[PDB]
Amino acid sequence: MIKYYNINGQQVPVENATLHVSDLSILRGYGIFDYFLAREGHPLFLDDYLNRFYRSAAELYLEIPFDKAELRRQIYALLQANEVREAGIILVLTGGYSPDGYTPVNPNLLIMMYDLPASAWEFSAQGIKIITHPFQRELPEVKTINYSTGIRMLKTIKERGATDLIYVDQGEWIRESARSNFFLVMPDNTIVTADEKILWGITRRQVIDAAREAGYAVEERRIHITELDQAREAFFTSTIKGVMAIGQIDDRVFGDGTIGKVTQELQDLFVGKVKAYLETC
Amino acid sequence: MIKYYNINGQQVPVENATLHVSDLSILRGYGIFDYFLAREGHPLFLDDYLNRFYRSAAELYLEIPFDKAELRRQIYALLQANEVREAGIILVLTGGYSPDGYTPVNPNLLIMMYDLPASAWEFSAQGIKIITHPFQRELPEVKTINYSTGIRMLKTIKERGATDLIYVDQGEWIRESARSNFFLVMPDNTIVTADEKILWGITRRQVIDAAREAGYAVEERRIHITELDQAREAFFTSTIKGVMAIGQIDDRVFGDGTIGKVTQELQDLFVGKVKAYLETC
Ligand SMILES: *Cc1c(COP(=O)(O)O)cnc(C)c1O
Ligand SMILES: *Cc1c(COP(=O)(O)O)cnc(C)c1O
């Protein structure tokens, strides 16, 4: 059971883990987020996740209080303190306890810890049902805390019989969901995913590398909404999903709705990347 | 000196006013904001501010825990407890202590209180210096907590010798700043302001009503970026600014940089609306 989180380098019991209401995340949604899994006592691809956290932080001009080695030390320390080998880990960096409820100061750094999600890498053979939604995320290259459109859409998603969405910039250009990268497999087995105005996911990185190592053509380009009709397969990548089959987008079933051949092969290769990472720890 | 805030109907000393880190504002920037002044012990235009708070809340499907009369009671109660007649009042409604760090639950309601800002209705004769910035706010009709673009821009604004910005949707359509409505006065004395994809401010409402009562033509329409060259005057409206002269946008000085005739008249009429409000309390 999880005992402690970390706030600004201090291990705190979870029930005393609070921020004063003057924090800019609370008042102004100002801050950055990262999330990664731990397996066999090891945060997966940690250097990549931590590099991204420091890059996100730079774009909001927030100084993380310690260097990457120290943050890594604190993460490992919090796994040992909670006596856990398998976990979800959130990093949050807020704009801080602003004097004027707008100007950022020293940021508040949060490290929170959860059980490894039950659904982590479920790899269901049955593809999920999703809807298109016209929208473009703000500062899309930055992993901000700003998830209001995706959270607000939950009601419409569930209402319409979907479990998720795919953002289409002005109903024209396929991007990503609120929390997942999006990919198409073409009938010639070319893999397509968005290159611009999307978050560069750590899963997306490992899956693209694994696809190119298997000899797949992987095109990073703008994707027109009409190109859904060209695709055999659709999947998401994310830290929790790994590779997740999408069986339906609006009124289009992909194949018979069950996971496509390349999607299944990419699930195995993703697990290959994980195992290869854990062999270097 | 301010003694108490209110969290979920409980008066709390300001130094114990905290949220648990599982709050969706902190993790996901999910929630809504309002701010109003109190003068002579009275929140200005309170019914309009509270109607807007309940409308914002509805759009994020967050239920405010009590009805408008009860919230009003709690606001008045917090003025009495702090023994203050002049103040700034923040309302925050977050997505709550989510079980999964995404799905909203019962929201957290915050009422915070500050001194009336020093700069409230300064009405400087010297117009401010601002820059255009290409950007469109998300859910612009909703007063969300999402101010990351405006806060992140602070550095560039100050760098470039400005004190503020004006968002232009795709560099074409004039909207608003991060925290102010934007208006143009044409040389025929027609007042122009954006009607769509901007927050409907309470100040903007009172100034538009006051302009129409003075016999001004007030056009609520889309404004092309090239129409800045048609305008004699530019001003902001906001709860703290009231009516604020803009003397420079990028490389354009409006007149001689000092407040324009209609802007000055609208400052007086705004104060007229305030006084008329306070006479009904
Ligand atoms: C976090 C996130 C992703 C996925 O990134 P991973 O590093 O694979 O978890 C995709 N899109 C958005 C908007 C995200 O926030
Ligand atoms: C709050 C706000 C305004 C101004 O509204 P007032 O009710 O006059 O203070 C304008 N634009 C945005 C985006 C705001 O959040």
Coordinates of C-alpha atoms and ligand atoms in Angstrom, one line a residue:
Chain A
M1 CA 0.0 0.0 0.0
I2 CA 1.4 3.5 -0.8
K3 CA 2.7 5.3 2.3
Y4 CA 4.6 8.4 1.0
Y5 CA 4.7 11.0 -1.8
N6 CA 7.5 13.5 -2.3
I7 CA 6.9 17.3 -2.1
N8 CA 9.9 19.6 -2.9
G9 CA 12.4 16.9 -1.9
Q10 CA 10.6 15.9 1.4
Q11 CA 9.0 12.4 1.8
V12 CA 5.4 13.1 3.2
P13 CA 2.7 10.7 4.2
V14 CA 0.1 10.7 1.4
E15 CA -2.6 12.1 3.8
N16 CA -0.4 15.2 4.5
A17 CA 0.5 15.7 0.8
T18 CA -1.1 19.2 0.1
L19 CA -0.4 22.5 -1.6
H20 CA -1.5 25.9 -0.4
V21 CA -4.4 27.3 -2.5
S22 CA -2.1 30.1 -3.9
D23 CA -0.3 27.5 -6.0
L24 CA -0.5 28.5 -9.7
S25 CA -1.7 25.0 -10.8
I26 CA -4.9 25.5 -8.8
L27 CA -5.5 29.1 -9.8
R28 CA -4.1 29.3 -13.4
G29 CA -3.5 25.7 -14.6
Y30 CA 0.2 26.6 -14.9
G31 CA 2.6 23.6 -14.8
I32 CA 3.9 20.5 -16.3
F33 CA 3.2 16.7 -15.9
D34 CA 5.0 13.4 -16.5
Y35 CA 4.0 9.8 -15.8
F36 CA 6.0 6.6 -16.2
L37 CA 5.7 3.0 -14.9
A38 CA 8.2 1.1 -12.7
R39 CA 8.7 -2.7 -13.2
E40 CA 11.2 -4.9 -11.3
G41 CA 11.9 -1.8 -9.1
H42 CA 12.9 0.3 -12.2
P43 CA 11.3 3.3 -13.8
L44 CA 11.0 2.3 -17.5
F45 CA 13.1 4.4 -20.0
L46 CA 13.6 6.9 -17.1
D47 CA 16.3 9.0 -18.8
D48 CA 13.9 9.7 -21.7
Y49 CA 11.0 10.6 -19.3
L50 CA 13.3 12.8 -17.2
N51 CA 14.8 14.5 -20.3
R52 CA 11.2 15.3 -21.4
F53 CA 10.3 16.7 -17.9
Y54 CA 13.3 19.1 -18.0
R55 CA 12.3 20.1 -21.6
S56 CA 8.6 20.7 -20.7
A57 CA 9.8 22.7 -17.6
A58 CA 12.2 24.9 -19.8
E59 CA 9.2 25.9 -22.1
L60 CA 7.3 27.2 -19.2
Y61 CA 10.5 28.9 -17.8
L62 CA 10.2 26.8 -14.5
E63 CA 13.5 25.8 -12.9
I64 CA 13.3 22.2 -11.4
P65 CA 15.0 22.7 -8.0
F66 CA 17.6 19.8 -8.5
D67 CA 19.5 18.2 -11.4
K68 CA 18.4 15.0 -13.2
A69 CA 20.6 12.7 -11.1
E70 CA 19.1 14.1 -7.8
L71 CA 15.5 13.8 -9.1
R72 CA 16.3 10.2 -10.2
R73 CA 17.8 9.6 -6.6
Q74 CA 14.5 10.9 -5.1
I75 CA 12.3 8.7 -7.4
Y76 CA 14.3 5.6 -6.4
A77 CA 14.2 6.7 -2.8
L78 CA 10.4 7.0 -2.9
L79 CA 10.1 3.4 -4.5
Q80 CA 12.2 2.1 -1.5
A81 CA 10.3 4.0 1.1
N82 CA 7.0 2.6 -0.3
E83 CA 8.6 -0.8 -0.6
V84 CA 7.2 -1.3 -4.2
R85 CA 8.7 -2.9 -7.4
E86 CA 5.7 -2.3 -9.7
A87 CA 4.1 1.3 -9.8
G88 CA 2.8 4.3 -11.6
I89 CA 4.8 7.5 -10.9
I90 CA 3.4 11.1 -11.5
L91 CA 5.8 14.0 -11.6
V92 CA 4.2 17.5 -11.3
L93 CA 5.9 20.9 -11.5
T94 CA 3.5 23.8 -10.8
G95 CA 4.1 27.5 -11.3
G96 CA 4.5 27.9 -7.5
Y97 CA 2.9 30.0 -4.7
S98 CA 2.7 33.2 -6.8
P99 CA 2.4 36.5 -4.9
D100 CA -0.2 37.9 -7.5
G101 CA -2.0 34.7 -8.6
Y102 CA -0.4 35.0 -12.1
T103 CA 3.4 35.5 -12.0
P104 CA 5.3 32.2 -11.5
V105 CA 7.9 31.8 -8.8
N106 CA 9.9 28.8 -7.5
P107 CA 7.8 25.9 -8.7
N108 CA 6.3 23.2 -6.4
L109 CA 7.6 19.7 -7.4
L110 CA 5.4 16.7 -6.7
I111 CA 6.3 13.0 -7.0
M112 CA 3.3 10.8 -6.5
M113 CA 3.1 7.0 -6.6
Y114 CA 0.3 4.4 -7.4
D115 CA -0.1 0.7 -8.0
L116 CA 0.8 -0.3 -11.6
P117 CA -2.6 0.2 -13.3
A118 CA -4.7 -3.0 -13.6
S119 CA -5.1 -2.3 -17.3
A120 CA -1.4 -1.6 -18.0
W121 CA -0.6 -3.2 -21.4
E122 CA -3.8 -5.3 -21.4
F123 CA -3.3 -5.7 -25.2
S124 CA -7.0 -6.6 -25.8
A125 CA -7.5 -8.4 -29.2
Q126 CA -10.8 -6.4 -29.4
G127 CA -10.1 -2.8 -30.8
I128 CA -11.6 0.1 -28.8
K129 CA -14.4 2.4 -30.1
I130 CA -13.4 6.1 -30.5
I131 CA -14.9 9.3 -31.9
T132 CA -13.2 12.1 -33.9
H133 CA -13.2 15.5 -32.1
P134 CA -12.2 18.8 -33.9
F135 CA -9.5 20.4 -31.5
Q136 CA -5.8 21.4 -31.3
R137 CA -4.0 21.3 -27.9
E138 CA -2.1 24.4 -26.7
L139 CA 1.8 24.1 -26.6
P140 CA 1.3 20.6 -28.0
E141 CA 5.1 19.8 -27.8
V142 CA 5.0 20.4 -23.9
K143 CA 3.5 17.9 -21.5
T144 CA 1.4 20.6 -19.6
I145 CA -1.1 19.9 -16.8
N146 CA -3.8 21.4 -19.3
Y147 CA -6.3 18.4 -19.9
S148 CA -9.6 20.3 -19.6
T149 CA -10.9 19.5 -23.2
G150 CA -10.1 15.8 -22.9
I151 CA -11.7 15.6 -19.4
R152 CA -14.8 17.7 -20.4
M153 CA -15.3 15.4 -23.4
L154 CA -15.6 12.3 -21.1
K155 CA -19.4 12.7 -20.8
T156 CA -19.9 13.0 -24.7
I157 CA -17.5 10.1 -25.3
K158 CA -19.4 7.7 -22.9
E159 CA -22.8 9.1 -24.1
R160 CA -21.9 8.2 -27.7
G161 CA -20.8 4.7 -26.9
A162 CA -17.1 5.4 -27.3
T163 CA -14.2 5.0 -24.7
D164 CA -11.9 7.7 -26.2
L165 CA -11.4 10.3 -28.9
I166 CA -8.9 11.4 -31.6
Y167 CA -8.3 15.2 -31.9
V168 CA -8.5 16.5 -35.4
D169 CA -7.0 20.0 -35.9
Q170 CA -9.8 22.0 -37.5
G171 CA -11.5 18.7 -38.6
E172 CA -8.6 18.3 -41.1
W173 CA -5.4 17.1 -39.5
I174 CA -5.2 13.9 -37.2
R175 CA -3.2 14.6 -34.1
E176 CA -3.5 12.5 -30.9
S177 CA -6.0 11.8 -28.0
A178 CA -5.7 13.8 -24.7
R179 CA -3.3 11.2 -23.3
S180 CA -2.2 8.9 -26.3
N181 CA -0.3 9.2 -29.6
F182 CA -2.2 7.9 -32.7
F183 CA -1.0 5.7 -35.6
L184 CA -2.4 4.3 -38.8
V185 CA -1.1 1.2 -40.6
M186 CA -1.7 1.4 -44.4
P187 CA -2.6 -1.7 -46.4
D188 CA 1.0 -1.8 -47.8
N189 CA 2.1 -2.0 -44.1
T190 CA 3.5 1.6 -44.1
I191 CA 3.0 3.0 -40.5
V192 CA 1.8 6.6 -40.4
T193 CA 1.8 9.0 -37.4
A194 CA 1.7 12.8 -36.9
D195 CA 5.1 14.6 -36.7
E196 CA 4.0 18.2 -35.7
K197 CA 1.6 19.8 -33.1
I198 CA 1.5 16.6 -30.9
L199 CA 3.3 15.6 -27.8
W200 CA 6.4 13.4 -28.6
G201 CA 5.5 10.4 -26.4
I202 CA 8.1 8.0 -24.9
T203 CA 5.9 5.0 -26.1
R204 CA 5.6 6.6 -29.6
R205 CA 9.4 6.8 -29.7
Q206 CA 10.0 3.1 -28.7
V207 CA 7.3 1.9 -31.1
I208 CA 8.6 4.0 -34.0
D209 CA 12.2 2.7 -33.3
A210 CA 10.9 -0.9 -33.0
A211 CA 8.9 -0.6 -36.3
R212 CA 12.0 0.7 -38.2
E213 CA 14.1 -2.1 -36.6
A214 CA 11.6 -4.7 -38.0
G215 CA 12.0 -3.1 -41.5
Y216 CA 8.6 -1.2 -41.5
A217 CA 8.4 2.1 -43.4
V218 CA 7.3 4.7 -40.7
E219 CA 6.1 8.0 -42.1
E220 CA 6.0 11.0 -39.6
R221 CA 3.9 13.6 -41.5
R222 CA 0.6 15.5 -41.4
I223 CA -2.3 13.0 -41.8
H224 CA -5.5 14.3 -43.6
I225 CA -8.8 13.1 -41.9
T226 CA -9.8 11.4 -45.3
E227 CA -6.6 9.2 -45.0
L228 CA -8.5 7.2 -42.2
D229 CA -10.2 5.5 -45.3
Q230 CA -6.8 4.5 -46.6
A231 CA -5.7 2.7 -43.3
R232 CA -6.1 -1.0 -42.5
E233 CA -5.3 -0.4 -38.8
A234 CA -5.4 2.3 -36.1
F235 CA -3.7 2.1 -32.6
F236 CA -2.8 4.4 -29.7
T237 CA 0.5 4.4 -27.8
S238 CA 0.8 5.7 -24.2
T239 CA 2.7 4.8 -21.1
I240 CA -0.3 2.8 -19.7
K241 CA -1.7 1.4 -23.0
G242 CA 1.6 0.4 -24.6
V243 CA 0.1 -0.4 -28.0
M244 CA -3.8 -0.5 -28.0
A245 CA -5.9 -1.6 -31.0
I246 CA -8.6 0.8 -32.2
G247 CA -11.4 -1.2 -33.8
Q248 CA -13.8 1.6 -34.6
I249 CA -13.5 5.4 -35.4
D250 CA -17.0 7.0 -35.6
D251 CA -18.9 4.9 -38.3
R252 CA -15.7 3.0 -39.6
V253 CA -14.8 -0.4 -38.4
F254 CA -11.1 -1.2 -39.0
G255 CA -11.1 -4.7 -40.5
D256 CA -13.4 -6.8 -38.3
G257 CA -12.8 -4.6 -35.2
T258 CA -10.1 -7.0 -33.8
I259 CA -6.4 -6.1 -33.5
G260 CA -4.6 -5.8 -36.9
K261 CA -1.4 -7.8 -37.8
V262 CA 1.1 -4.9 -37.5
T263 CA -0.5 -3.6 -34.3
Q264 CA -0.1 -7.1 -32.7
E265 CA 3.6 -7.3 -33.9
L266 CA 4.2 -3.8 -32.4
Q267 CA 2.7 -4.9 -29.0
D268 CA 5.3 -7.7 -28.9
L269 CA 8.2 -5.4 -30.0
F270 CA 7.2 -2.8 -27.4
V271 CA 7.4 -5.5 -24.7
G272 CA 10.9 -6.3 -26.3
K273 CA 12.0 -2.7 -25.8
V274 CA 10.8 -2.9 -22.1
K275 CA 12.7 -6.2 -21.4
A276 CA 15.8 -4.8 -23.2
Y277 CA 15.6 -1.7 -20.9
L278 CA 15.2 -3.7 -17.7
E279 CA 18.3 -5.9 -18.8
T280 CA 20.4 -2.6 -18.7
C281 CA 19.2 -1.8 -15.0
Chain B
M1 CA -5.1 41.9 7.2
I2 CA -6.8 38.8 5.7
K3 CA -7.4 36.1 8.3
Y4 CA -9.6 33.4 6.6
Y5 CA -10.4 31.9 3.2
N6 CA -13.4 29.5 2.6
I7 CA -12.8 25.8 1.4
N8 CA -16.0 23.8 0.7
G9 CA -18.2 26.0 3.1
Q10 CA -15.6 25.9 6.0
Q11 CA -13.9 29.2 7.0
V12 CA -10.1 28.2 7.3
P13 CA -7.1 30.4 8.4
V14 CA -5.2 31.3 5.2
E15 CA -2.1 29.4 6.4
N16 CA -4.2 26.1 6.6
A17 CA -6.0 26.6 3.3
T18 CA -4.6 23.6 1.2
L19 CA -5.8 20.9 -1.2
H20 CA -4.6 17.4 -1.4
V21 CA -2.3 16.9 -4.4
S22 CA -4.9 14.5 -6.0
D23 CA -7.0 17.6 -6.8
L24 CA -7.7 17.7 -10.6
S25 CA -6.7 21.4 -10.8
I26 CA -3.1 20.5 -9.8
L27 CA -2.8 17.3 -12.0
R28 CA -5.1 18.2 -15.0
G29 CA -5.8 22.0 -14.9
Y30 CA -9.5 21.1 -14.6
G31 CA -11.7 23.8 -13.2
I32 CA -13.2 27.2 -13.3
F33 CA -12.3 30.7 -11.9
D34 CA -14.1 34.0 -11.1
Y35 CA -12.8 37.2 -9.6
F36 CA -14.7 40.4 -8.5
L37 CA -14.0 43.4 -6.3
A38 CA -15.9 44.4 -3.1
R39 CA -16.4 48.2 -2.3
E40 CA -18.3 49.6 0.7
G41 CA -18.7 46.0 2.0
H42 CA -20.4 44.9 -1.3
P43 CA -19.2 42.5 -4.1
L44 CA -19.7 44.6 -7.3
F45 CA -22.4 43.3 -9.8
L46 CA -22.4 40.1 -7.8
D47 CA -25.4 38.5 -9.4
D48 CA -23.7 38.8 -12.8
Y49 CA -20.4 37.3 -11.5
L50 CA -22.2 34.5 -9.8
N51 CA -24.5 33.7 -12.8
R52 CA -21.2 33.4 -14.8
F53 CA -19.6 31.1 -12.3
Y54 CA -22.6 28.8 -12.4
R55 CA -22.5 28.9 -16.3
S56 CA -18.7 28.1 -16.4
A57 CA -19.3 25.3 -13.9
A58 CA -22.2 23.8 -16.0
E59 CA -19.8 23.7 -19.1
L60 CA -17.3 21.5 -17.3
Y61 CA -20.3 19.4 -15.7
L62 CA -19.1 20.4 -12.2
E63 CA -21.9 20.8 -9.6
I64 CA -21.3 23.8 -7.3
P65 CA -22.3 22.2 -3.9
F66 CA -24.8 25.0 -2.8
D67 CA -27.2 27.3 -4.6
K68 CA -26.4 31.0 -5.6
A69 CA -28.1 32.4 -2.4
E70 CA -25.9 30.2 -0.2
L71 CA -22.7 31.0 -2.1
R72 CA -23.6 34.7 -1.8
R73 CA -24.2 34.2 2.0
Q74 CA -20.7 32.5 2.3
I75 CA -19.0 35.4 0.4
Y76 CA -20.7 38.0 2.7
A77 CA -19.8 35.9 5.7
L78 CA -16.1 35.8 4.6
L79 CA -16.0 39.6 4.2
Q80 CA -17.4 40.0 7.8
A81 CA -15.0 37.4 9.2
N82 CA -12.0 39.3 7.6
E83 CA -13.6 42.6 8.8
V84 CA -13.0 44.1 5.3
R85 CA -15.1 46.6 3.1
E86 CA -12.7 46.8 0.1
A87 CA -11.3 43.5 -1.4
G88 CA -10.5 41.2 -4.2
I89 CA -12.4 37.9 -4.1
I90 CA -11.4 34.8 -6.1
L91 CA -13.8 31.9 -6.6
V92 CA -12.3 28.5 -7.7
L93 CA -14.1 25.3 -8.6
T94 CA -11.7 22.4 -9.3
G95 CA -12.6 19.0 -10.7
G96 CA -12.1 17.5 -7.2
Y97 CA -10.0 14.7 -5.6
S98 CA -10.3 12.3 -8.6
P99 CA -9.8 8.5 -8.0
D100 CA -7.8 8.1 -11.3
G101 CA -6.2 11.5 -11.7
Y102 CA -8.6 12.3 -14.7
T103 CA -12.3 11.6 -13.9
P104 CA -13.9 14.5 -12.1
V105 CA -15.9 14.0 -8.9
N106 CA -17.3 16.4 -6.3
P107 CA -15.5 19.6 -7.0
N108 CA -13.4 21.5 -4.4
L109 CA -14.8 25.1 -4.0
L110 CA -12.4 27.8 -2.9
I111 CA -13.2 31.4 -1.8
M112 CA -10.1 33.5 -1.4
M113 CA -9.8 37.2 -0.4
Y114 CA -7.1 39.9 -0.9
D115 CA -6.8 43.7 -0.4
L116 CA -8.4 45.7 -3.3
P117 CA -5.5 45.8 -5.8
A118 CA -3.4 49.1 -5.5
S119 CA -3.8 49.6 -9.3
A120 CA -7.6 48.9 -9.3
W121 CA -9.1 51.5 -11.8
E122 CA -5.9 53.6 -11.9
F123 CA -7.2 55.1 -15.1
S124 CA -3.7 56.3 -16.3
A125 CA -3.9 59.0 -19.0
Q126 CA -0.7 57.3 -20.5
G127 CA -1.9 54.3 -22.7
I128 CA -0.1 51.0 -22.1
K129 CA 2.3 49.3 -24.6
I130 CA 1.1 45.8 -25.9
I131 CA 2.1 43.3 -28.5
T132 CA -0.1 41.1 -30.8
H133 CA 0.2 37.4 -30.2
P134 CA -1.3 34.7 -32.6
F135 CA -3.4 32.4 -30.3
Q136 CA -7.1 31.2 -29.6
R137 CA -8.1 30.3 -26.0
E138 CA -9.8 26.9 -25.4
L139 CA -13.5 26.9 -24.4
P140 CA -13.2 30.8 -24.7
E141 CA -16.8 31.4 -23.4
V142 CA -15.9 29.6 -20.1
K143 CA -13.8 31.3 -17.4
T144 CA -11.5 28.2 -16.9
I145 CA -8.4 28.1 -14.7
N146 CA -6.3 27.6 -18.0
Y147 CA -4.0 30.7 -18.2
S148 CA -0.8 28.9 -19.3
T149 CA -0.3 30.8 -22.7
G150 CA -0.8 34.2 -21.0
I151 CA 1.5 33.3 -18.1
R152 CA 4.2 31.7 -20.3
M153 CA 4.2 34.9 -22.5
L154 CA 5.1 37.2 -19.5
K155 CA 8.8 36.8 -20.3
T156 CA 8.5 37.7 -24.0
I157 CA 6.1 40.6 -23.2
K158 CA 8.5 42.2 -20.6
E159 CA 11.5 41.3 -22.9
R160 CA 9.9 43.3 -25.8
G161 CA 9.2 46.4 -23.7
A162 CA 5.4 45.6 -23.5
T163 CA 3.2 45.1 -20.3
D164 CA 0.5 43.0 -22.0
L165 CA -0.7 41.3 -25.2
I166 CA -3.7 40.9 -27.5
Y167 CA -4.5 37.4 -28.8
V168 CA -5.2 37.3 -32.5
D169 CA -6.8 34.0 -33.7
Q170 CA -4.5 32.7 -36.4
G171 CA -3.0 36.2 -36.8
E172 CA -6.3 37.3 -38.4
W173 CA -9.1 37.9 -35.8
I174 CA -8.7 40.1 -32.7
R175 CA -10.0 38.5 -29.5
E176 CA -8.9 39.5 -26.0
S177 CA -5.8 39.4 -23.7
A178 CA -5.4 36.5 -21.1
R179 CA -7.4 38.5 -18.5
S180 CA -9.0 41.5 -20.4
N181 CA -11.6 42.2 -23.1
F182 CA -10.4 44.4 -26.0
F183 CA -12.1 47.3 -27.7
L184 CA -11.4 49.7 -30.6
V185 CA -12.9 53.2 -31.1
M186 CA -13.2 54.1 -34.7
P187 CA -12.7 57.8 -35.9
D188 CA -16.5 58.1 -36.3
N189 CA -16.8 57.1 -32.6
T190 CA -18.2 53.6 -33.4
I191 CA -17.0 51.3 -30.6
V192 CA -15.9 47.8 -31.9
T193 CA -15.3 44.6 -29.8
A194 CA -15.3 40.9 -30.5
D195 CA -18.6 39.0 -30.1
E196 CA -17.4 35.3 -30.6
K197 CA -14.6 33.1 -29.1
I198 CA -13.9 35.4 -26.2
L199 CA -15.0 35.4 -22.5
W200 CA -18.1 37.6 -22.0
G201 CA -16.6 39.9 -19.2
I202 CA -18.7 41.6 -16.6
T203 CA -16.7 44.8 -17.2
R204 CA -17.3 44.5 -21.0
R205 CA -21.0 44.1 -20.3
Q206 CA -21.3 47.3 -18.1
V207 CA -19.1 49.3 -20.6
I208 CA -21.1 48.2 -23.6
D209 CA -24.4 49.1 -21.8
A210 CA -22.9 52.4 -20.7
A211 CA -21.7 53.2 -24.3
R212 CA -25.2 52.4 -25.8
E213 CA -26.8 54.6 -23.0
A214 CA -24.5 57.5 -24.1
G215 CA -25.8 57.0 -27.7
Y216 CA -22.6 55.3 -29.0
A217 CA -22.8 52.8 -31.8
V218 CA -21.3 49.5 -30.4
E219 CA -20.5 46.8 -32.9
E220 CA -20.0 43.2 -31.6
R221 CA -18.5 41.4 -34.6
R222 CA -15.3 39.7 -35.8
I223 CA -12.5 42.3 -36.0
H224 CA -9.8 41.8 -38.7
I225 CA -6.2 42.5 -37.6
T226 CA -5.9 45.1 -40.4
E227 CA -8.8 47.0 -38.7
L228 CA -6.3 48.2 -36.0
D229 CA -5.2 50.8 -38.7
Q230 CA -8.9 52.0 -38.8
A231 CA -9.1 52.7 -35.0
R232 CA -8.4 56.0 -33.2
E233 CA -8.4 54.3 -29.8
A234 CA -7.8 50.9 -28.1
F235 CA -8.7 49.9 -24.5
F236 CA -9.0 46.9 -22.3
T237 CA -11.8 46.2 -19.8
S238 CA -11.4 43.9 -16.8
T239 CA -12.5 43.6 -13.2
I240 CA -9.2 45.2 -12.0
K241 CA -8.5 47.6 -14.9
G242 CA -12.1 48.9 -15.4
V243 CA -11.3 50.8 -18.7
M244 CA -7.5 51.0 -19.5
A245 CA -6.1 53.1 -22.3
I246 CA -3.8 51.2 -24.8
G247 CA -1.4 53.7 -26.3
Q248 CA 0.7 51.3 -28.4
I249 CA 0.2 48.0 -30.2
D250 CA 3.4 46.6 -31.7
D251 CA 4.7 49.5 -33.9
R252 CA 1.4 51.6 -33.9
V253 CA 0.9 54.5 -31.5
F254 CA -2.8 55.3 -31.0
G255 CA -3.0 59.1 -31.3
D256 CA -0.2 60.5 -29.2
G257 CA -0.2 57.5 -26.8
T258 CA -2.4 59.2 -24.2
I259 CA -6.0 58.1 -23.4
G260 CA -8.5 58.8 -26.2
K261 CA -11.7 60.9 -25.7
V262 CA -14.2 58.0 -25.8
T263 CA -12.0 55.8 -23.6
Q264 CA -11.9 58.6 -21.0
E265 CA -15.8 59.0 -21.2
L266 CA -16.2 55.2 -20.8
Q267 CA -13.9 55.3 -17.6
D268 CA -16.4 57.9 -16.1
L269 CA -19.5 55.9 -17.2
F270 CA -18.0 52.7 -15.8
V271 CA -17.6 54.4 -12.4
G272 CA -21.2 55.6 -12.9
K273 CA -22.4 51.9 -13.2
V274 CA -20.4 51.0 -10.0
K275 CA -21.9 53.9 -8.0
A276 CA -25.4 53.0 -9.4
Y277 CA -24.8 49.3 -8.3
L278 CA -23.6 50.3 -4.8
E279 CA -26.8 52.6 -4.4
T280 CA -29.0 49.3 -4.8
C281 CA -27.1 47.5 -1.9
Ligands
LIG1 C1 1.5 11.9 -22.1 C2 0.9 12.1 -23.4 C3 1.0 11.3 -24.5 C4 1.7 9.9 -24.4 O1 3.1 10.0 -24.0 P1 3.8 8.7 -23.4 O2 5.2 9.3 -23.0 O3 3.8 7.5 -24.4 O4 2.9 8.3 -22.2 C5 0.4 11.6 -25.7 N1 -0.3 12.8 -25.8 C6 -0.4 13.6 -24.8 C7 -1.2 14.9 -25.0 C8 0.1 13.3 -23.6 O5 0.0 14.2 -22.6
LIG2 C1 -11.8 37.2 -16.6 C2 -11.5 37.5 -18.0 C3 -11.8 38.6 -18.7 C4 -12.5 39.8 -18.1 O1 -13.7 39.5 -17.4 P1 -14.2 40.6 -16.3 O2 -15.5 39.9 -15.9 O3 -14.4 42.0 -16.9 O4 -13.1 40.6 -15.3 C5 -11.5 38.7 -20.1 N1 -10.9 37.6 -20.7 C6 -10.6 36.5 -20.0 C7 -9.9 35.4 -20.8 C8 -10.8 36.4 -18.7 O5 -10.5 35.3 -18.0

